Amino acid sequence: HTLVWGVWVNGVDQGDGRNIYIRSPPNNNPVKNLTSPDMTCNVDNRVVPKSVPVNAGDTLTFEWYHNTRDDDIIASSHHGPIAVYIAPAASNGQGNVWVKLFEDAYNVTNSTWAVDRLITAHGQHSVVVPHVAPGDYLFRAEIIALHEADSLYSQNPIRGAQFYISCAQITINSSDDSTPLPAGVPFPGAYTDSTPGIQFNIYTTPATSYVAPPPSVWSGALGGSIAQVGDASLE
Ligand SMILES: [Cl-]
Ligand SMILES: [Cl-]
Ligand SMILES: [Cl-]
Ligand SMILES: [Cl-]
Ligand SMILES: [Cl-]
Ligand SMILES: [Cl-]
Ligand SMILES: [Cl-]
Ligand SMILES: [Cu+2]
């Protein structure tokens, strides 16, 4: 159970974004139905009044929280991967539009899930803004909690993979457009009951064998990190 508070651009807090530049849902409950319209941008997908200005190459940091800013972030039981997708804003997230910029699942080198590192990072994970056409975009940050994912939600609706989905309105101003954004995948639709990484038993299947759901990270993507960029407590 987790939400996005706001974003940072090159280590500068853009301030509380909830219902302002984040298409915030009414609460921190997960989406679980893979065919739901709520898979696009959670249960209250609408245009909010602001879009955060960035340039290609900027570090864009998402900041998550549970109940209050810079708290426990997400329950430690909620082990799983983190992804970020981008789509042009005029799509409203509809159709074959979502391009993956970032994936982090289980790191073999340090024996930790992305969610575990997110908590240590005070809810902060980043992407480099890609060299796409200037204009208005949606950045779709997705946490999949796998602690009940040995069941399919379609077979037991009390259980299933839990999707914490947050869409931020981002405006890219300066960009050389050296990597035009291609078509991508649809949400809902990209994840199905048969997709690798959706049904996984963390209690009996080694995390070293986990494969996160496709699609693969776009060739145009410039990278990211799970790491604290800024101290929320210094405000
Ligand atoms: Cl940043
Ligand atoms: Cl704006
Ligand atoms: Cl906890
Ligand atoms: Cl936007
Ligand atoms: Cl550029
Ligand atoms: Cl294309
Ligand atoms: Cl990949
Ligand atoms: Cu939860």
Which neighbouring-strand residues pair with 12? 9
Q: Which ligand is nearest to the CA of 89?
A: 4
CA of 175 to the centre of ligand 5 (A): 4
Residue 18, annotated ligand binder?
A: no
Q: How was this structure determined?
A: X-ray
What's CA 52's distance to the chain center, in Å? 17
User: What is the per-residue DSSP string for 76-137?
Assistant: TT----EEEEEEEGGGTT-SS-BEEEEEE-EETTTTEEHHHHHHHTTTEEEEEPPS--SEEE
Q: Which ligand is nearest to the CA of 131?
A: 5
Token pair in block for residue 124? 């902060």
User: What is the per-residue DSSP string for 37-82?
Assistant: GGGTT-S-----S--EEE-TT-EEEEEEESSSTTS--S-TT----E
Q: How many CB atoms lie within 10 A of CB 79?
A: 22
Fold observed for domain 3-234: Coagulation Factor XIII; Chain A, domain 1 (2.70.50)
Residue 162, annotated ligand binder?
A: yes
Tell me, in Å, the resolution of the deposited structure: 1.3
CA of 177 to the centre of ligand 4 (A): 17
The answer to whether 98 and 41 have CB atoms below 8 angstroms apart is no
CA of 155 to the centre of ligand 5 (A): 47
Question: Comparing C-alpha atoms, which of 141, 125, 162 is closest to residue 87?
Answer: 141
The answer to whether 85 and 184 have CB atoms below 8 angstroms apart is yes
CA of 7 to the centre of ligand 2 (A): 14
The answer to whether 162 and 170 have CB atoms below 8 angstroms apart is no
CA of 49 to the centre of ligand 2 (A): 6
Q: How many CB atoms lie within 10 A of CB 146?
A: 27
Q: Which ligand is nearest to the CA of 100?
A: 7
CA of 177 to the centre of ligand 8 (A): 38
The answer to whether 54 and 91 have CB atoms below 8 angstroms apart is no
CA of 24 to the centre of ligand 4 (A): 14
User: Rounded to an integer, what distance in angstroms lies between the CA atom of residue 24 and that of residue 180?
Assistant: 28
Residue 140, annotated ligand binder?
A: yes
